[PDB]
Design a protein around this ligand. Structure first.
Ligand SMILES: CCCCCCCCCCCCCCCC(=O)O
Ligand SMILES: CCCCCCCCCCCCCCCC(=O)O
Length: 130
């Protein structure tokens, strides 16, 4: 299975600044990063996932197997041990650092929602070729 596989780019986001402040992203990276339409690349092979998030020179590479312990490198660079689960046929769900993350794919649109307390940080991305 390779349902999530693809190359995607941010179209729009909500609450970037409030969320990144709350998690402790350096102010310099908040200000430089707020208008970056980052590129996300996902390679899925059954339960095994590799994903790359690129925003300028900043490249975050992660991998996990659904249902197994993984170590996810977050935006600050903090690495957190967690588990990513499938929810329904189109969602990837996990929690780290008290952040609830939901990644939902519908056709060529991926929506990622991260909520920390009352702060909801929503990203909409669109497939950009192969
Ligand atoms: C060359 C100047 C450096 C640019 C630094 C960019 C700062 C990163 C911006 C954060 C983008 C948010 C990515 C989160 C991805 C996700 O939620 O899955
Ligand atoms: C960098 C923070 C760790 C991310 C934790 C979520 C792991 C499951 C989702 C992986 C697919 C990545 C899709 C991201 C799309 C986007 O950039 O908004």
């Amino acid at each position: 299975g390779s349902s999530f596989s693809g190359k995607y780019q941010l179209q729009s986001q909500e609450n970037f600044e409030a969320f990144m402040k709350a998690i402790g992203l350096p102010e310099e990276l908040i200000q430089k990063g707020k208008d970056i339409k980052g590129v996300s690349e996902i390679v899925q092979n059954g339960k095994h996932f590799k994903f790359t998030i690129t925003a300028g020179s900043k490249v975050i590479q992660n991998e996990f197997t659904v249902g197994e312990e993984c170590e996810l490198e977050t935006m600050t660079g903090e690495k957190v041990k967690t588990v990513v689960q499938l929810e329904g046929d189109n969602k990837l769900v996990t929690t780290f650092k008290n952040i609830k993350s939901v990644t939902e794919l519908n056709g060529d649109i991926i929506t990622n929602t991260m909520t920390l307390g009352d702060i909801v940080f929503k990203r909409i991305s669109k497939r950009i070729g192969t």
